[PDB]
Paper text:
The FrpD43-271 protein (FrpD), a construct lacking the first 42 residues encompassing the N-terminal signal peptide (residues 1–24) and the linker sequence (residues 24–43), has been previously characterized. The protein crystallized in two alternative crystal forms, belonging to the hexagonal space group P64 and the orthorhombic space group P212121, both accommodating a single molecule in the asymmetric unit. Experimental phases were obtained from single-wavelength anomalous dispersion (SAD) of crystals of selenomethionine-labelled FrpD protein (SeMet FrpD) grown in the orthorhombic space group. The structure of the SeMet FrpD protein was refined to 1.4 Å resolution with an R value of 16.8% (Rfree of 19.3%). Here, we determined the crystal structure of the FrpD43-271 at 1.4 Å resolution. The refined crystallographic models of FrpD comprise 224 of the 229 residues, with one N-terminal and four C-terminal residues being disordered. Both FrpD structures are largely identical, with a coordinate root-mean-square deviation (rmsd) of 0.56 Å over the 224 aligned residues. The structure is characterized by a C-terminal α-helix (α3) that traverses a series of antiparallel β-strands. A single disulphide bond in a right-handed spiral conformation is present between the Cys150 and Cys227 residues. The electrostatic surface potential map revealed that the FrpD surface is highly negatively charged, except for a single positively charged region located at the β9 and β10 strands of the structure.
Residue numbers in the entry: 44 to 267
The structure:
Amino acid sequence: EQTSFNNPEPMTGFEHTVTFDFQGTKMVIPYGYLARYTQDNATKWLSDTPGQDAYSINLIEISVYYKKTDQGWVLEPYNQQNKAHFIQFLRDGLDSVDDIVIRKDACSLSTTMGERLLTYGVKKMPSAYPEYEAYEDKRHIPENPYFHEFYYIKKGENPAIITHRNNRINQTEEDSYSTSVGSCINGFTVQYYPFIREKQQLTQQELVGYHQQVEQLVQSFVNN
Ligand code: NA
């Protein structure tokens, strides 16, 4: 197989697509979601290669810019309005651009994760979305009064586990929350650390909202 970077810098991110193949299963991705697959300060972008039906891969790593709006947070491909955020990201990773890793594998999220959490002393709490079970870990650590973690677990056809935790361990430090998401969407595994520049505690609505956008996005790639 041969790689090509024949596409221009995007204006919207939707002007071209690239076709990928996971052992026969195709995914067609608007090229603005592929900022890591570029050359020369994001002036040459990955393109379908003549004579090759698809890029045969084991994983795809898309990159999305996340942005606050009046209607929530939204995810964007590279475009002329947000490009400076991607340029910073490509230099040192230090901007509001998240990576989402897509593979094609059988789901291995536990259908009994919540039961396990209960056995560990993590407690169930009310959920804003009935299809998610919510849990809060407030277990006591004498040396770490800041220990605090949340889980939001979805089952169904496309299960997901969202973990949101305070990374602060001392008193001079500030609160610094981070998030992990593991999920299975339409036969794919989709794993990511969203909101990478946010240190503030995020609500269930912010976290589930992001994941709903990711589910729609990944599904749009196999609608083609
Ligand atoms: Na690659």
